[PDB]
Amino acid sequence: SIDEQSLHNARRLFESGDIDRIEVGTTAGLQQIHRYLFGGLYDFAGQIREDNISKGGFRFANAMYLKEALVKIEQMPERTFEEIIAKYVEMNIAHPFLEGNGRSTRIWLDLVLKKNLKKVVNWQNVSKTLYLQAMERSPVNDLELRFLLKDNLTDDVD
Amino acid sequence: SIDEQSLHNARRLFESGDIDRIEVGTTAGLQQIHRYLFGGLYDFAGQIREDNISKGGFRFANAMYLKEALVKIEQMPERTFEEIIAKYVEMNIAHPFLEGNGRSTRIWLDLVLKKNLKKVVNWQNVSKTLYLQAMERSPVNDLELRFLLKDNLTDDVD
Ligand SMILES: Nc1ncnc2c1ncn2[C@@H]1O[C@H](COP(=O)(O)OP(=O)(O)NP(=O)(O)O)[C@@H](O)[C@H]1O
Ligand SMILES: Nc1ncnc2c1ncn2[C@@H]1O[C@H](COP(=O)(O)OP(=O)(O)NP(=O)(O)O)[C@@H](O)[C@H]1O
């Protein structure tokens, strides 16, 4: 029931206009989103992880320098589509939470895209399978991800 | 001639007993080794890289938080074989130089093993192919590496 309740919570962030009070493009901002989605569901909601984690043969940033990584990641520029995806890709590698990084950082991405390009990702039309592939490859090369997301943008941001 | 001269330079470090002045298990120590091996061969000899690099579908620690990562990596403990390989594995992910990380960090590893376990890796008997595989997998899981290196130790350290 967690996946369900976290979705309802995401549904509520926008419907309530609380999304508009989230800090855009910062670590603190990502933590806000995560806290709001998973508050009361995961007891680590909003908290940077202590432990190391890996998935599908990738290891995310070592917990021991995760906080330091995040300090630099949030400072990355958001001027162009390419720069925003670059930032998104790094924040993914950072993977600051034990769980729920995906939903939360996607929202995080959309807010950056909205602020700087007046656009958001039309996730309806994005294949979950292809997205996951693109992300898996992203650290070595973000071509697949850019190609996937660029023609799935929409300026219909509300 | 890089790879052969750098080899000659590695011979010297030991034959001259200069190896014994290298700081053991620290970032500075690794820089010393690199500087000794590649001094006058690479103009970045001994220097932490500013640029990002990747190999065989792995991307090494982002240049932007590489210095911070190193500060934490050098502090890792060296009491047991498992802990030493753990440290070695992290320093590999860090991959602080544009080139020459392999030769230099292996020497770095041997010094740590020597100090703490009174043993070194008998690289003669270590398959290059298998080592490279083990390393490639090491961030996700260091089993292959430990298995490879444990029964290739020698207490005949000089
Ligand atoms: N092998 C991989 N390499 C890099 N990134 C990955 C990999 N696998 C997954 N990811 C990213 O991390 C996210 C999954 O992280 P996780 O913290 O499990 O979020 P989640 O909400 O539990 N699952 P999901 O809703 O499917 O994203 C995915 O959406 C990808 O963006
Ligand atoms: N795909 C990979 N993923 C993780 N680590 C790797 C990968 N490929 C190589 N390595 C490690 O990085 C080392 C080589 O890094 P590099 O910067 O090329 O140094 P090098 O000294 O030029 N090569 P070598 O002399 O063979 O060790 C290898 O010895 C491995 O320990």
SS3 B40: coil
- Using a CB-CB distance cutoff of 8 angstroms, which residues of chain A are in contact with residue B65? 65, 68-69, 71-73
Burial bucket for residue B83 (CB in 10 Å: 0-12, 13-18, 19+):
middle
DSSP chain A: -HHHHHHHHHHHHHHTTGGGGSPTTSHHHHHHHHHHHHBTTBTTTTPPPSS--EETTEE---GGGHHHHHHHHTTS--SSHHHHHHHHHHHHHH--SSS-HHHHHHHHHHHHHHHHHS-EE-GGGS-HHHHHHHHHHTTT--HHHHHHHHTTEES---
Q: How far is CA B78 from CA B47, B75, B114, B122, in A?
A: 24, 9, 11, 19
Which residue carries 């670059």 as its tokens?
A86
Q: How far apart are the first and last CA of chain B?
A: 28
Helix (H) or strand (E) holding B154: strand B153-154
C-alpha A147/C-alpha A31 separation (Å) is: 28
Which residue carries 């509300």 as its tokens?
A158
Of all residues in chain A, the one with the smallest CA distance to B64 is: A72
DSSP one-letter code for B20:
G
C-alpha A44/C-alpha B85 separation (Å) is: 30
Q: Name residue B139's amino acid.
A: P
C-alpha A133/C-alpha B64 separation (Å) is: 25
Q: Is any atom of ligand 1 closer than 6 Å to the C-beta of A54?
A: no
B140 touches chain A (CB under 8 A): yes
Backbone angles phi, psi at B57, to 5 degrees: 70, 20
Q: Which of B89, B79, B88, B91 is nearest to B117 (CA)?
A: B79
Burial track A20-58 (b if 16+ CB lie within 10 A, e otherwise): eebeebbbebbbbbbbbbbeebbebbbebbeeeeeeeeb
The percent of chain B in helix, strand and coil, each rounded to the nearest 5, is: 60, 5, 35
Burial bucket for residue A16 (CB in 10 Å: 0-12, 13-18, 19+):
exposed
Q: To 10 degrees, what angle do helices B66-73 and B81-94 make?
A: 170
Chain centroid to Cα B91, Å, comes to: 7
Which residue carries 């590999």 as its tokens?
B92
Q: Can you read off the two tokens belonging to residue A126?
A: 């994005």
Q: How far is CA B119 from CA A88, A143, B16, B30, in A?
A: 44, 45, 20, 19
Q: What is the resolution of this structure in A?
A: 3.0
Is B111 in contact with B29 (CB distance < 8 Å)? yes
Q: Can you read off the two tokens belonging to residue A68?
A: 């330091």
SS3 B10: helix
List Cβ neighbours of B11 (8 Å cut-off, separation of 6 or more). none
Helices (H), B16-158: 27-38, 66-73, 81-94, 101-117, 128-137, 143-150
Q: How far is A17 from chain B (nearest CA, A)?
A: 35
Q: Any idea what the Cα angle at residue A155 is, between residues A29 and A10, rounded to 5°? A: 40
Q: Check B62 against A72: CB less than 8 A apart.
A: yes
Q: How far is CA A113 from CA A108, B101, B105, in A?
A: 9, 38, 41
Q: Name residue A140's amino acid.
A: V
C-alpha B40/C-alpha B8 separation (Å) is: 13
B126 touches chain A (CB under 8 A): no
C-alpha B44/C-alpha B132 separation (Å) is: 24
- Using a CB-CB distance cutoff of 8 angstroms, which residues of chain A are in contact with residue B140? 54, 57-59
Is A10 in contact with A108 (CB distance < 8 Å)? no
Helix (H) or strand (E) holding B55: strand B54-55
Domains with residue ranges and CATH for chain B: 1-158 (1.10.3290.10)
**Technique used to solve these coordinates:** X-ray
Q: Check A68 against B64: CB less than 8 A apart.
A: no
Backbone angles phi, psi at A7, to 5 degrees: -70, -50
Measure the CA dihedral B112/B114/B119/B125, to 10°: 70
Of all residues in chain A, the one with the smallest CA distance to B54 is: A140
Of all residues in chain A, the one with the smallest CA distance to B136 is: A57
